[PDB]
Design a protein around this ligand. Structure first.
Ligand code: NI
Length: 186
């Protein structure tokens, strides 16, 4: 059965149990990620801020089944429009809130991308997205507050496309990890 993670350690524990196979029960993953109550002292080692944009901080490589990671968000920090490389994507807020702008995959004309829905992901909630559903932008709308979000991606992926909101054009991007296991990694 799915047990409540009492700490980030206990959450890491269950995740390795959930992905101990070949498929993914997205349902149970989102409930337990949501069930772990964020404890700042437990994940502060991974939340390394960068003044300019957001960064990705690896927390656990999931024995190859997934890359768990934390992405701090300075005031005003946000992403371009992107996809998730045919893999699952879970995003749980550990601190603050984030704006999520949903978009459909562009047709083919060099047309503007109109949002298909938006929402504020709240501190401690866990959302999910995958390519079949559609794309999204992530943005910390705050002017004086930093956000921290815990992401789960399976299978792991480092490359993905960004999409221009005015044309639907796409470009491949190969993301990098700011830190790995509580160590800066230039
Ligand atoms: Ni995303």
């Amino acid at each position: 059965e799915l047990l409540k993670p009492r700490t980030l350690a206990d959450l890491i524990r269950i995740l390795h149990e959930l992905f101990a196979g070949d498929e993914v029960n997205v349902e149970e993953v989102q409930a337990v990620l949501e069930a772990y109550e964020s404890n700042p002292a437990e994940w502060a080692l991974y939340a390394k801020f960068d003044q300019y944009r957001y960064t990705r901080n690896l927390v656990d490589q999931g024995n190859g089944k997934f890359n768990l990671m934390i992405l701090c968000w300075g005031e005003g920090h946000g992403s371009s429009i992107h996809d998730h490389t045919d893999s699952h994507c879970f995003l749980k807020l550990l601190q603050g809130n984030l704006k999520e702008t949903l978009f459909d995959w562009p047709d083919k004309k060099s047309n503007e991308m109109i949002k298909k829905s938006e929402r504020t992901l709240r501190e401690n909630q866990c959302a999910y997205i995958n390519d079949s559903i559609g794309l999204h932008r992530v943005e910390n709308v705050s002017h004086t507050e930093p956000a921290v979000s815990l992401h789960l991606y399976s299978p792991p992926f480092d490359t993905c496309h960004a999409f221009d909101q005015r044309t639907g054009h796409k470009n491949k991007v190969t993301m990098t990890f700011h830190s790995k296991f509580g160590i800066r990694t230039p």
